[PDB]
A paper describes a structure:
Light-harvesting 2 (LH2) antenna complexes augment the collection of solar energy in many phototrophic bacteria. We used cryo-electron microscopy (cryo-EM) to determine the 2.1 Å resolution structure of this LH2 antenna, which is a cylindrical assembly of nine αβ heterodimer subunits, each of which binds three bacteriochlorophyll a (BChl) molecules and one carotenoid. Overlaps between the macrocycles of the B850 BChls ensure rapid transfer of excitation energy around this ring of pigments, which act as the donors of energy to neighboring LH2 and reaction center light-harvesting 1 (RC–LH1) complexes.
The LH2 complex was purified from Rba. sphaeroides strain B7, which was engineered to ensure uniformity of the complexes assembled. Restricting the carotenoid pathway in this way removes the possibility of LH2 complexes assembling with a mixture of spheroidene and spheroidenone, minimizing heterogeneity. The LH2 complex is assembled as an inner ring comprising nine transmembrane α-apoproteins, which is 46 Å diameter in the transmembrane part of the complex and an outer, 76 Å diameter ring of nine β-polypeptides. Near the cytoplasmic face of the complex there is a ring of nine BChls, which absorb maximally at 800 nm and are designated as B800; each B800 is coordinated by the N-terminal carboxymethionine of LH2-α, part of a network of interactions with nearby residues on both LH2-α and LH2-β and with the carotenoid. The C3-acetyl carbonyl of B800 forms hydrogen bonds with the β-Arg30 side chain, as shown by an earlier resonance Raman and mutagenesis study. Nine carotenoids, which are spheroidene in the strain we analyzed, snake through the complex, traversing the membrane and interacting with a ring of 18 BChls situated toward the periplasmic side of the complex. Toward the periplasmic side of the LH2 complex, and ligated to α-His31 and β-His40, there are nine pairs of BChls, with their macrocycles oriented perpendicular to the plane of the membrane.
Author numbering:
A (entry chain BF), B (entry chain BG), C (entry chain BE), D (entry chain BH), E (entry chain BD), F (entry chain BI), ...: 5 to 51
J (entry chain AF), K (entry chain AG), L (entry chain AE), M (entry chain AH), N (entry chain AD), O (entry chain AI), ...: 1 to 50
Amino acid sequence: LNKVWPSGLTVAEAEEVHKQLILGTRVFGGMALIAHFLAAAATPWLG
Amino acid sequence: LNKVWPSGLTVAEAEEVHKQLILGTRVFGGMALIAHFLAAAATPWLG
Amino acid sequence: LNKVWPSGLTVAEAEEVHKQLILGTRVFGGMALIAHFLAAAATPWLG
Amino acid sequence: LNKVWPSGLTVAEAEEVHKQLILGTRVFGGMALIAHFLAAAATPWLG
Amino acid sequence: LNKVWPSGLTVAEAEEVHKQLILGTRVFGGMALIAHFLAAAATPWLG
Amino acid sequence: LNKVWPSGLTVAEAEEVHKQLILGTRVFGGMALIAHFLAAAATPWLG
Amino acid sequence: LNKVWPSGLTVAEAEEVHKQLILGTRVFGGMALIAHFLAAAATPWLG
Amino acid sequence: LNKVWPSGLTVAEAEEVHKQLILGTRVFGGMALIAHFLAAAATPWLG
Amino acid sequence: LNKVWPSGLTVAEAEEVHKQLILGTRVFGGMALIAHFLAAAATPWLG
Amino acid sequence: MTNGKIWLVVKPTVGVPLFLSAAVIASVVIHAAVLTTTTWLPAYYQGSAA
Amino acid sequence: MTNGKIWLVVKPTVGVPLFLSAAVIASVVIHAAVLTTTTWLPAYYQGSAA
Amino acid sequence: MTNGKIWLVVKPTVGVPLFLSAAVIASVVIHAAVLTTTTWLPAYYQGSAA
Amino acid sequence: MTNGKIWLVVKPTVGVPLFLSAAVIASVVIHAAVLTTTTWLPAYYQGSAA
Amino acid sequence: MTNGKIWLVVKPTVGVPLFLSAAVIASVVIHAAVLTTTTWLPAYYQGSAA
Amino acid sequence: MTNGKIWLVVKPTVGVPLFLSAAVIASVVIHAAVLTTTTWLPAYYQGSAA
Amino acid sequence: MTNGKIWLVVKPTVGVPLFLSAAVIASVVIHAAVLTTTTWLPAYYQGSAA
Amino acid sequence: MTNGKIWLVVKPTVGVPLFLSAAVIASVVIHAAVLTTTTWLPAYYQGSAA
Amino acid sequence: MTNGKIWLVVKPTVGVPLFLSAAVIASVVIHAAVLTTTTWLPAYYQGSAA
Ligand code: BCL
Ligand code: BCL
Ligand code: BCL
Ligand SMILES: COC(C)(C)C/C=C/C(C)=C/C=C/C(C)=C/C=C/C(C)=C/C=C/C=C(C)/C=C/C=C(\C)CC/C=C(\C)CCC=C(C)C
Ligand SMILES: COC(C)(C)C/C=C/C(C)=C/C=C/C(C)=C/C=C/C(C)=C/C=C/C=C(C)/C=C/C=C(\C)CC/C=C(\C)CCC=C(C)C
Ligand SMILES: COC(C)(C)C/C=C/C(C)=C/C=C/C(C)=C/C=C/C(C)=C/C=C/C=C(C)/C=C/C=C(\C)CC/C=C(\C)CCC=C(C)C
Ligand SMILES: COC(C)(C)C/C=C/C(C)=C/C=C/C(C)=C/C=C/C(C)=C/C=C/C=C(C)/C=C/C=C(\C)CC/C=C(\C)CCC=C(C)C
Ligand SMILES: COC(C)(C)C/C=C/C(C)=C/C=C/C(C)=C/C=C/C(C)=C/C=C/C=C(C)/C=C/C=C(\C)CC/C=C(\C)CCC=C(C)C
Ligand SMILES: COC(C)(C)C/C=C/C(C)=C/C=C/C(C)=C/C=C/C(C)=C/C=C/C=C(C)/C=C/C=C(\C)CC/C=C(\C)CCC=C(C)C
Ligand SMILES: COC(C)(C)C/C=C/C(C)=C/C=C/C(C)=C/C=C/C(C)=C/C=C/C=C(C)/C=C/C=C(\C)CC/C=C(\C)CCC=C(C)C
Ligand SMILES: COC(C)(C)C/C=C/C(C)=C/C=C/C(C)=C/C=C/C(C)=C/C=C/C=C(C)/C=C/C=C(\C)CC/C=C(\C)CCC=C(C)C
Ligand SMILES: COC(C)(C)C/C=C/C(C)=C/C=C/C(C)=C/C=C/C(C)=C/C=C/C=C(C)/C=C/C=C(\C)CC/C=C(\C)CCC=C(C)C
Ligand SMILES: CCCCCCCCCCCC[N+](C)(C)[O-]
Ligand SMILES: CCCCCCCCCCCC[N+](C)(C)[O-]
Ligand SMILES: CCCCCCCCCCCC[N+](C)(C)[O-]
Ligand SMILES: [Ca+2]
Ligand SMILES: [Ca+2]
Ligand SMILES: [Ca+2]
Ligand SMILES: [Ca+2]
Ligand SMILES: [Ca+2]
Ligand SMILES: [Ca+2]
Ligand SMILES: [Ca+2]
Ligand SMILES: [Ca+2]
Ligand SMILES: [Ca+2]
């Protein structure tokens, strides 16, 4: 567990970093999904 | 709390940095919001 | 087998890295294959 | 307060640097403001 | 023969690396040769 | 006064460097001012 | 003659490197010469 | 005077470097002056 | 004369390097001079 | 979600700026593509001037 | 507001210049897009010369 | 599948960002090519404004 | 005025050249935009030759 | 096949990414050239919309 | 004249080449702008030929 | 053949990638020039299509 | 002639290549400008062909 | 011939690749200029085709 890999992180630190990246991606995606529905409603795209 | 992460910061220092970034973003956003209202009022955009 | 190569990895670590790359490529390829069938069905490409 | 931060500066040194940046910005802005009045008076911009 | 050259490799390691590069090139070339026959058959190139 | 700052200079060395930059700028500006008068006299710019 | 120069090579190693570069250049040139005769025969260049 | 400055040079070495730069500039300028007279004589520039 | 300068060379090594550069330049120039005579003879340049 | 070990062998100070920069560039590319290929988006900027 | 741990794994001397540079570039891109696609912003610069 | 030893001699913090960046760029290149060479993809963006 | 702590975490030898370079580039961009979009600034350079 | 000593004096972490990147770029260049200079490849993308 | 402390926190090995390079680039930009937007400077190069 | 001492003062890990990269770029430039200036090479790609 | 102390605070291995490179680039820029803005220089290259 | 001391203060591993690269680029620039400004050089590539 305590092994420090060539990035300088441990396994647990690397998972902690990625979990925040996953969370941020979900926030971005949720906003983007709303923006696409707005774009579909308000622009000529999709009619 | 003492742990120095691979950026060279502690948790507390990293939060202190980001809080100033958050503050600066709010200032920029407040100015940008005013600029958009001015743009809407003075330019042909939105009529 | 404990030899550390000039990348900083051992043989076993290098295989572990590449296996995740292989897995990720298969996921990307599966999605891309689906996207090509959708493109063929919904766009004028291939008729 | 003698702490040397990752930039290599102390708090007091960092404030001393920024104060010179603030001063220089004010000089640039004062000159730019004069240049805009000249531009407004001498060019067709704003009539 | 255990001399370490300025790349960080020994003679034996350098040949091991290159042999994999040779193998990969042969795979790429085999696929490219097939792709050229497909291109010649399916496209207007060469008639 | 003998403190060495993060650039590697002392205060006195930094002032000595900048004085040569100021001097060089004045020379460049003197030549440029002459060149602008020549440009105004010999080119259609300003009539 | 065992002196190590600023590249990290000895005289003998530097000649060994260059001799392989010379050999590779001759191979490339031989192929290029054949390609130019093919180009002259098969293309409108030189008639 | 034997002080080594942040470039790695002493005052005397720095002047020796610059003197060769001055000399080279004079050679370039002499050649360029001749080239301008040739250009003026042989091209439509200046008539 | 054995002083090592900031390039890592001695005076004698630096002269040895440059002499090979001078020689190479003369070879390039000799070839270029021949190529210019060929260009003048074979192309419409200079008639 | 399963790729978290990437940060054992890629430095986050490399990969996280690259990841976010790529997202930002991608968004700009998409907006620029829509702007350059539709009439309706430049008409939105043009507003009552047309 | 919750992402402050980013500065544990990204160097601020990398990420803060990048963040602000990206904002600056983005603003220029938006202003340039409006300038190039509208008539009204070029007319503003042209002023009474039209 | 057989090339896993590449990571003995290439640093993953170089090669993995490069690999993924190349994939991303390749995808953009393909999408941009289709957008610039077809009528049907810009018509899709144009939507009912045509 | 309140942001002086930025120089605790950004190296001034990075950020100060970047800051001033960005200002210089911004000024050039603005002057170039005016030159390319107005007729009056080109006519100023053209002078009596028009 | 005889050039394997190149990796005694070139770092593989430089030369292997460069080698593969050059191959990738070369392929893109060839595909782009065919796309831009033929009618038949853009017609293939255009499909039934022509 | 009062800014000489800039060289306490900016390396002259960085800032002095940048400063002079920016001046050189700026001069080229100005000369190129005059060349491209006037007729009189191209005519000066053209000389007696037209 | 007589220049082998170049590798005493140039790093091969610099100069050998540069040398080969320059050769590769040069070849692409020549092929691109022929493609862009002849009719016969784009006709070769066009094949029976036109 | 009086600026020789520049090499106390600028590394010659930076500044001397930059200085000479800038001179070389400047010369190319001037030659290219004359080539692109005169009829007489391209006519010199064209020679007896036209 | 008299400038050999340049290699006391410029690293040859910098300056020699730069010197040769500049020569190579210069040659390409000259050939490209002739190709783009004459008819006779593209006619030479075009050969018997036109
Ligand atoms: C109208 C729709 C468009 C179009 C739109 C798109 C878009 C948009 C995209 C693609 C993408 C791809 N398209 Mg498509 N595509 C079109 C038509 C084609 C045609 C064709 C002749 O008509 C081909 C050959 C392809 C092929 C491809 C793939 C190369 C690629 C996805 C690869 C992947 O997932 O690998 C995954 C691989 C695997 C799962 C297994 C691989 C196993 C084998 C054995 C490996 C062999 C390796 C080889 C020997 C060496 C490789 C060397 C390296 C290149 C260095 N498309 C049409 C014209 N296509 C995507 C892409 O490139 O993404 C980056 C993408 O985004
Ligand atoms: C229709 C076909 C095209 C065409 C298509 C192509 C294509 C496509 C390519 C070439 C390539 C080459 N072409 Mg051709 N080529 C055409 C017509 C020409 C004409 C001409 C006047 O008509 C010339 C001079 C050339 C010449 C050349 C070579 C310079 C080059 C291969 C060099 C090599 O293998 O060296 C090997 C060298 C040796 C074996 C020995 C050298 C020994 C000598 C003594 C060394 C002297 C060195 C000198 C003094 C200093 C050099 C300094 C360095 C440049 C820094 N071609 C026609 C118009 N040509 C290829 C290329 O450039 O690849 C990179 C290539 O890919
Ligand atoms: C038809 C022919 C073309 C033409 C073709 C070319 C070509 C081609 C070239 C030049 C080159 C040059 N041309 Mg001409 N040139 C033309 C017409 C002009 C006109 C003009 C108003 O008509 C001017 C001012 C110039 C001027 C110049 C020089 C700036 C330059 C050579 C400088 C040199 O050798 O310095 C040497 C310097 C000295 C010997 C002494 C200097 C001493 C002084 C006191 C130093 C003062 C420094 C100052 C205060 C600060 C400088 C700051 C730095 C810029 C950072 N040409 C015509 C239109 N010219 C060459 C060039 O730029 O090469 C790089 C070049 O290759
Ligand atoms: C027609 O073709 C055109 C022209 C349109 C071109 C084609 C374009 C295409 C194909 C575009 C495709 C775009 C795609 C695929 C976009 C994908 C976007 C995604 C997935 C975005 C994700 C965003 C995620 C974000 C913003 C995440 C932020 C995370 C943050 C801020 C957390 C930061 C902190 C950490 C990573 C670690 C903290 C440390 C700890 C110890 C906890
Ligand atoms: C049609 O398509 C077009 C062409 C328009 C292209 C599309 C463009 C698009 C899609 C543009 C989108 C733009 C966006 C998303 C812009 C976002 C802007 C934001 C969020 C700006 C934020 C600015 C924040 C600022 C300026 C913050 C400054 C902070 C400062 C100065 C504090 C500095 C100090 C620290 C960080 C730490 C100090 C240290 C301590 C120890 C306290
Ligand atoms: C007509 O010409 C045009 C214009 C179209 C130009 C031509 C374009 C062409 C020819 C395009 C060709 C495109 C190709 C060949 C695309 C290939 C795409 C592939 C193969 C994509 C693969 C993607 C793979 C992914 C996304 C893998 C992700 C893996 C992840 C996230 C795992 C990360 C973790 C690790 C590597 C190691 C973790 C550590 C451990 C210790 C386990
Ligand atoms: C229509 O769209 C177009 C095309 C126009 C594009 C749009 C362009 C836009 C949106 C442009 C916007 C431009 C802006 C926002 C410009 C802002 C300019 C500013 C704020 C300039 C500030 C300049 C400040 C200067 C020059 C400060 C100089 C400071 C100096 C010299 C002091 C140096 C010393 C130190 C920092 C520390 C010394 C050390 C000590 C220990 C004391
Ligand atoms: C008309 O002109 C146009 C416009 C067309 C432009 C002209 C373009 C031209 C002239 C293009 C020419 C293209 C050429 C010459 C392409 C050549 C392609 C080749 C030779 C490709 C080779 C590919 C090889 C590959 C993909 C090899 C992969 C190897 C792998 C993955 C193994 C990796 C592992 C290691 C190297 C070492 C592992 C470590 C160990 C210890 C065993
Ligand atoms: C219409 O828009 C267009 C298209 C025109 C674009 C717009 C362009 C614009 C807005 C251009 C603006 C240009 C400006 C603002 C130019 C400014 C030029 C300046 C201020 C030039 C200054 C030059 C200074 C020089 C050459 C100084 C040289 C100094 C030397 C050689 C001394 C070197 C030594 C040292 C620094 C230290 C020595 C060490 C010691 C220990 C003493
Ligand atoms: C009209 O103008 C246009 C547009 C055409 C532009 C003009 C273009 C022009 C002027 C192009 C000119 C092109 C030229 C001059 C091309 C020259 C090509 C040459 C000389 C190519 C040489 C290739 C050599 C190769 C591929 C050598 C490979 C060597 C290898 C693989 C060996 C590698 C190993 C080592 C170096 C050392 C190993 C270590 C040991 C210890 C033994
Ligand atoms: C219309 O606008 C257009 C388009 C034309 C653009 C405008 C362009 C403009 C404005 C161009 C202006 C060009 C200028 C100002 C050019 C200036 C040229 C100069 C000053 C050239 C100087 C050349 C100097 C040389 C070649 C010196 C060489 C020195 C050498 C080789 C010595 C090397 C050794 C050492 C430095 C140190 C040795 C070590 C020792 C210990 C002794
Ligand atoms: C109309 O304007 C256009 C468009 C044409 C643009 C204008 C272009 C212009 C103005 C172009 C000007 C071009 C010029 C000035 C070209 C100059 C070319 C020269 C001088 C070339 C010199 C070449 C020299 C070579 C190839 C030397 C090679 C040397 C070698 C291989 C030796 C290598 C070894 C060492 C340096 C050291 C070995 C170590 C030891 C210890 C002995
Ligand atoms: C990477 C960005 C790619 C953008 C590609 C689109 C550029 C404009 C294409 C031509 C204009 C299409 N049109 C006429 C419908 O506007
Ligand atoms: C755009 C002009 C750029 C000029 C070069 C700027 C400095 C490059 C980096 C070398 C100097 C810094 N350092 C620490 C290595 O000495
Ligand atoms: C535009 C030509 C560029 C030529 C390549 C750049 C010069 C070589 C730089 C070498 C840097 C690595 N080094 C100093 C350890 O050798
Ligand atoms: Ca809609
Ligand atoms: Ca409005
Ligand atoms: Ca279909
Ligand atoms: Ca006005
Ligand atoms: Ca066929
Ligand atoms: Ca006048
Ligand atoms: Ca023929
Ligand atoms: Ca004349
Ligand atoms: Ca002739």
